[PDB]
Ligand binder design. Structure first.
Ligand SMILES: [Ca+2]
Ligand SMILES: [Ca+2]
Ligand SMILES: [Ca+2]
Ligand SMILES: [Ca+2]
Lengths: 218, 218
């Protein structure tokens, strides 16, 4: 398999945003009167688009006032403010992106988060220039684990999805890359460390600091 | 997870057609002058749509005369004749489908094979009446492991994909069902035995004769 491009996941892979999304969700849900202690009633939501999480909450504990979409955009805005404020770049990111270029690869971003947030996070770490294409799953009918966002990214990159390696922190994200028939590297979130399903990935890293050219190219 | 429907894979799951497809591909490729001994050069193609397989051969050893699409149609026609001839219903099928109905489920079919072939195989085993919906990936941009065919089946059935259990014999088919966010039961092909990636399935059966109500509903 000939690798021409590397596509990075964003939340929990490039940035330590999972705690920040949690906080944004918590704060907004609490403001609506939603009983948060019942968080255990929801399925695992790691890697799921925010709209799916808000829908899950709304199915357990409906609320009045703002619609689910209005709640989605409040959570998004809050998560973004938290990201700007803390600048949570994960270890090894800068080096990993550089390595991709050193190894002759195009570089993409494929995320469930809105395109404006993708642009914002990359620009804030002076990484926008290194990314040849960005793809958001926001407007799409289905986000990860549906492969559409990854296929869109490959198309914007101008390469066959088969020539891509996707770096992910979640099972849902990994499945999206495999449903697109891509090579997969995972750097599992702390919340997912010993998930047996990561056996589907081609490479498993404890951190992006450990990333090598062999991991990328096979 | 409340299960409302069961969607069966076709080839290798309901019918023992994988060896018949092999024979159809072999015979057609041999007629084109294609050096069959180099079959080892292709990747694992289990569960891939025939067009992808023809493209894989054509990339290695491009022939003249019939186009890839003309070759696809020739292989399909040969495969169908072989199925009609041998009528290779796999063990436990009729009982599995009956079990689904006894457990209150709608029944779907989702396959990479052409719709006309799906109608033919079902009608040939007096199973067409038991199936509430059929979905073929033949006309789609991407077949399994892309989830589109499974999502189309769920839509034709009239249920949320989250309420579906997909029965598959391949990793590629399983990934498609998991990319659609469905429950997964696998009855691994003889070729795919011991594939570690079946750990993603919710249930793994050695045969459909082993299918129980608990496997379907969880
Ligand atoms: Ca992620
Ligand atoms: Ca170089
Ligand atoms: Ca830069
Ligand atoms: Ca199959």
């Amino acid at each position: 398999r000939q690798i021409l491009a590397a596509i990075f996941d964003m939340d929990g892979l490039l940035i330590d945003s999972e705690p920040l999304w949690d906080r944004a969700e918590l704060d907004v849900m609490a403001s609506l009167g939603v009983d948060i202690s019942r968080r255990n009633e929801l399925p695992d939501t790691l890697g799921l688009r925010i709209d799916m999480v808000v829908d899950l909450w709304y199915a357990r504990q409906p609320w009045n006032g703002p619609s689910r979409q209005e709640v989605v955009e409040r959570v998004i805005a809050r998560a973004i403010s938290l990201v700007e404020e803390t600048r949570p770049l994960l270890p090894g990111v800068r080096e990993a992106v550089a390595l991709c270029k050193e190894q002759g690869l195009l570089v993409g971003l494929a995320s469930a988060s809105p395109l404006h947030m993708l642009e914002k996070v990359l620009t804030m770490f002076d990484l926008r220039d290194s990314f040849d294409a960005l793809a958001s799953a926001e407007k799409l009918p289905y986000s990860k684990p549906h492969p559409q966002v990854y296929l869109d990214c490959a198309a914007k990159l101008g390469v066959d999805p088969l020539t891509c390696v996707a770096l992910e922190d979640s099972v849902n994200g990994m499945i999206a890359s495999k449903a697109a028939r891509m090579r997969s590297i995972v750097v599992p979130a702390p919340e997912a460390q010993n998930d047996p399903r990561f056996v589907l990935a081609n490479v498993k890293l404890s951190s992006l600091t450990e990333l090598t050219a062999k991991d990328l190219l096979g």
